């Protein structure tokens, strides 16, 4: 797999959400984000390749996408209600979660 391409999808679609006009554009971007996040959780960062999948480091790496996907879901609930501004403000959580996980 390739964890870097999944972050491309995540970052690119987060910018689509910020500059979106309607709830459909937001829902479509979040949908692509959720798939990318699920695949990203499977891979291993190039800094933890000599550790174990059961080690605390990999457990914490996967934990970050548990949180990230929960926040995608937070925004999807709102987009599904047609609440554009609310869904955009909920996706701002993803900025923080992204910023906190660049290890």
């Amino acid at each position, epitope marked *: 797999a390739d964890l870097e391409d999944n972050w491309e999808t995540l970052n690119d679609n987060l910018k689509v959400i910020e500059k979106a006009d309607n709830a459909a554009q937001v829902k479509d971007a979040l949908t*692509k984000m*959720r*798939a990318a996040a699920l*695949d990203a959780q499977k891979a291993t960062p190039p800094k933890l390749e000599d550790k174990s999948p059961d080690s605390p480091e990999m457990k914490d790496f996967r934990h970050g996408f548990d949180i990230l*996907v929960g926040q995608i879901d937070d925004a999807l609930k709102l987009a599904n209600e047609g609440k554009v501004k609310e869904a955009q403000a909920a996706a701002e959580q993803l900025k923080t979660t992204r910023n906190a996980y660049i290890q």
Partner: antibody
Amino acid sequence: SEVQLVESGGGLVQPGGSLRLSCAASGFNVVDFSLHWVRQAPGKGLEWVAYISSSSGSTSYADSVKGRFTISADTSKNTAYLQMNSLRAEDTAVYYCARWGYWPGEPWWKAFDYWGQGTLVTVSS
Amino acid sequence: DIQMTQSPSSLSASVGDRVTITCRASQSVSSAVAWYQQKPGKAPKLLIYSASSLYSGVPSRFSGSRSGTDFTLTISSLQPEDFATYYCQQYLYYSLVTFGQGTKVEIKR
């Protein structure tokens, strides 16, 4: 010692009428799982209808039933309901209810691991 | 609206044959694909989840695989009790569920 779901309330309803289906859970708590309705018209495939989170209150519906169906839950009796209004002939189907665990964790990944036996709704004059 | 394109719609195979059912997702759903077996008159039963995990209690002659957006259900050694209609399903999110059109499997004898 076994999880099961039991749909009831199915039967004949006149066109334009209303009918309420129930999905009674046993062996597990509806607060712990999302609950979904999937229907199958005679000879046709599976069509997802609606879902409810009993814990949060969040819902969603298929475009084909949006504005006509309302899904709800009563946690005290461990049961979900599908209230179907303005029924039409093309709503005739076996209606199944199924559980699907919450994110995060293996329960989310197991999708519809338990289904009820299904109840037949017939829309006809 | 994510589409699952399932093929073939029907097939007939002898006991012992290897049977392959395919499902194409219109966009990425990660590995959030399940396969179900439905006997006539009964609720679907889960066979495979997360594209390739064998559900507990399902015989190991059933298996699944993912390749990008291409998903495959394989029955390695078809048994007479395997006659059914099989469905793929993508479950990327609670509100997005769609199913494949189904594959009716008949037994030749």
